[PDB]
Amino acid sequence: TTPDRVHEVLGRSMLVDGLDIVLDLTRSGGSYLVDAITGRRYLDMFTFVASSALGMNPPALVDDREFHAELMQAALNKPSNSDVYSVAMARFVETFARVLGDPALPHLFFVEGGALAVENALKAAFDWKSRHNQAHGIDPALGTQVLHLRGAFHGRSGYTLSLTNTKPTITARFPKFDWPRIDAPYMRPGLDEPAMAALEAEALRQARAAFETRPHDIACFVAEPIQGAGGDRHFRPEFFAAMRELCDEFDALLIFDEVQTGCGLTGTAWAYQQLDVAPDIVAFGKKTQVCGVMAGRRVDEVADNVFAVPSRLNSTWGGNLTDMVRARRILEVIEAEGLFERAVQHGKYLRARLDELAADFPAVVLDPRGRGLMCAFSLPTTADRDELIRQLWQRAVIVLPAGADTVRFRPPLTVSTAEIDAAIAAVRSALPVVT
Amino acid sequence: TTPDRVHEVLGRSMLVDGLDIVLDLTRSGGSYLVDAITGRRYLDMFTFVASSALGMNPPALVDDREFHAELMQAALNKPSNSDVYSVAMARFVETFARVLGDPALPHLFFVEGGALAVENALKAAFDWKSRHNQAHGIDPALGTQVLHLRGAFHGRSGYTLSLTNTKPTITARFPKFDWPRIDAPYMRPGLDEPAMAALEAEALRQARAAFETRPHDIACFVAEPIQGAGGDRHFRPEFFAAMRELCDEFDALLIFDEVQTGCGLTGTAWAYQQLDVAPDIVAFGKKTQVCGVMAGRRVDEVADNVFAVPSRLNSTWGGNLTDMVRARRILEVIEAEGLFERAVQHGKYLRARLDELAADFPAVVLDPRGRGLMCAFSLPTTADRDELIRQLWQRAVIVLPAGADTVRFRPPLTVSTAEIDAAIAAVRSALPVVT
Ligand SMILES: *Cc1c(COP(=O)(O)O)cnc(C)c1O
Ligand SMILES: *Cc1c(COP(=O)(O)O)cnc(C)c1O
Ligand SMILES: O=C(O)CCC(=O)C(=O)O
Ligand SMILES: O=C(O)CCC(=O)C(=O)O
Task: Report yes or no: A144 and A217 within 8 Å, Cβ to Cβ.
Answer: yes
B218 and B150 share a domain? yes
A248 and A309 share a domain? yes
A287 and A271 share a domain? yes
Which residues 290-319 in chain A show a CB within 8 A of chain B? 307-317
Sheet arrangement for strand A397-398? A32-34, A41-44, A397-398
- Nearest-CA residue for ligand 2 atom 10 is B154
Closest CA to A328 of A55, A26, A71: A71
Smallest CA–CA distance, residue A81 to chain B, in Å, is: 9
A94 and A117 share a domain? yes
The sign of the dihedral angle between the CA atoms of B415, B418, B420, B426 is negative
Q: Is A184 annotated as a binding residue?
A: no
DSSP B206-243: HHHHHHHHSTTTEEEEEE-SEESTTTSEE--HHHHHHH
A332 and A356 share a domain? no
CA distance A7 to A35: 13
What's the total number of domains in chain A? 2
A354 and A239 share a domain? no
CA distance B31 to B413: 10
Residue where a domain stops, chosen among A319, A338, A357:
A338
Residues of A356-365 as b/e, b for ≥16 C-beta within 10 angstroms? ebbeebeebb
The CA distances from residue B334 to A35, B268, B288, in Å, are 33, 11, 12
Which residues 16-45 in chain A show a CB within 8 A of chain B? 16-19, 21-23, 25-26, 33, 36
* Residue B189 neighbours by CB distance under 10 Å: 10
Q: How far is CA A312 from the centre of its chain?
A: 25
Closest CA to B293 of B283, B307, B279, B278: B283
Q: Is A285 annotated as a binding residue?
A: no
Number of A–B residue contacts, CB under 8 Å:
305
Strands (E), A212-325: 218-223, 226-227, 233-234, 253-257, 281-284, 291-295
Strands A400-402 and B41-44: unpaired
CATH of the domain at B231: 3.40.640.10
Q: Which resolution in angstroms does this entry have?
A: 2.7
Smallest CA–CA distance, residue A384 to chain B, in Å, is: 21
Which residues 228-287 in chain A show a CB within 8 A of chain B? 285-286
Atom of ligand 1 nearest to the CA of A113: 7
- Residue ranges lining ligand 3, Cβ < 6 Å: A 49, 153, 170, 228-229, 260; B 314, 316
DSSP B254-299: EEEE-TTTTTTTTSSSSTHHHHT---SEEEE-GGGSSEEEEE-GGG
How far does residue B154's CA lie from ligand 2's centre (Å)? 6
* Residue A429 neighbours by CB distance under 10 Å: 14
Instruction: Note whether B19 contacts A83, CB cutoff 8 Å.
Output: yes
Which residues 45-64 in chain A show a CB within 8 A of chain B? 48-49, 51-52, 56-57, 61-62
* Residue B103 neighbours by CB distance under 10 Å: 7
Smallest CA–CA distance, residue A194 to chain B, in Å, is: 39
CA distance B247 to A36: 46
Instruction: Note whether B52 contacts A77, CB cutoff 8 Å.
Output: yes
A114 and A148 share a domain? yes
Give yes or no for residue B157 CB within 6 A of ligand 1: no
Experimental technique used? X-ray
Strands (E), A272-417: 281-284, 291-295, 366-371, 374-378, 397-398, 400-402, 406-409
* Closest by Cβ to A123, choosing from B90, B97, B174: B174
Q: Is A115 annotated as a binding residue?
A: yes
Determine whether A433 is exposed, middle or buried from the number of CB atoms within 10 Å of its CB (0-12, 13-18, 19+).
Answer: exposed
CA distance B182 to B178: 13
The CA distances from residue A434 to A65, A359, A395, in Å, are 48, 17, 14
Closest CA to A285 of A96, A125, A107: A96
CA distance B430 to B433: 5
B53 and B122 share a domain? no
* Closest by Cβ to A6, choosing from B5, B83, B85: B85
Smallest CA–CA distance, residue B30 to chain A, in Å, is: 11
B31 and B163 share a domain? no
Backbone phi, psi, residue A77, to 5°: -135, 170
**Selected residue of B81, B173, B313 to mutate for chain A interface (largest A Cβ count, 10 A):** B173
Closest CA to B121 of B301, B243, B253: B253
Closest CA to A256 of A294, A291, A286: A294
CA distance A265 to A260: 8
CATH of the domain at A408: 3.90.1150.10
* Residue A38 neighbours by CB distance under 10 Å: 11
Spell out the residues 6+ positions from residue A212 whose beta carbon is closer than 8 angstroms to its own: none
User: What SS3 class is residue A25?
Assistant: coil
The CA distances from residue B156 to A17, A22, A120, B114, B226, in Å, are 30, 35, 9, 9, 19
Within A250-314, where are the H helices?
272-275
Give yes or no for residue B228 CB within 6 A of ligand 2: yes
Task: Report yes or no: B330 and B397 within 8 Å, Cβ to Cβ.
Answer: no
Packing angle between helix A65-75 and helix A321-336, nearest 10 degrees? 160
Q: How far is CA B319 from the centre of its chain?
A: 17
Residue where a domain stops, chosen among A308, A338, A368:
A338
A328 and A193 share a domain? yes
CA distance A149 to A156: 16
Instruction: Tell me the residue range of the domain where A364 lies.
Output: 1-57+339-435
B356 and B268 share a domain? no
CA distance A227 to A223: 8
Closest CA to A260 of A92, A47, A81: A47
Residue where a domain stops, chosen among A313, A338, A363:
A338
CA distance A314 to B229: 14
The CA distances from residue A409 to A231, A266, A376, A377, B78, in Å, are 11, 12, 6, 9, 19
State the binding site of B.
114-115, 156, 260, 408
Task: Report yes or no: B384 and B434 within 8 Å, Cβ to Cβ.
Answer: yes
Closest CA to A230 of A373, A378, A361, A121: A378
Atom of ligand 1 nearest to the CA of A157: 9
Spell out the residues 6+ positions from residue B95 whose beta carbon is closer than 8 angstroms to its own: B328, B331, B332
Closest CA to A290 of A333, A341, A330: A330
| B80: nearest CA partner in chain A | A48
Closest CA to A294 of A78, A111, A54: A111
How far separated are the first and last CA of chain A, in Å rounded?
A: 43
How far does residue B316's CA lie from ligand 3's centre (Å)? 7
* Residue B432 neighbours by CB distance under 10 Å: 9
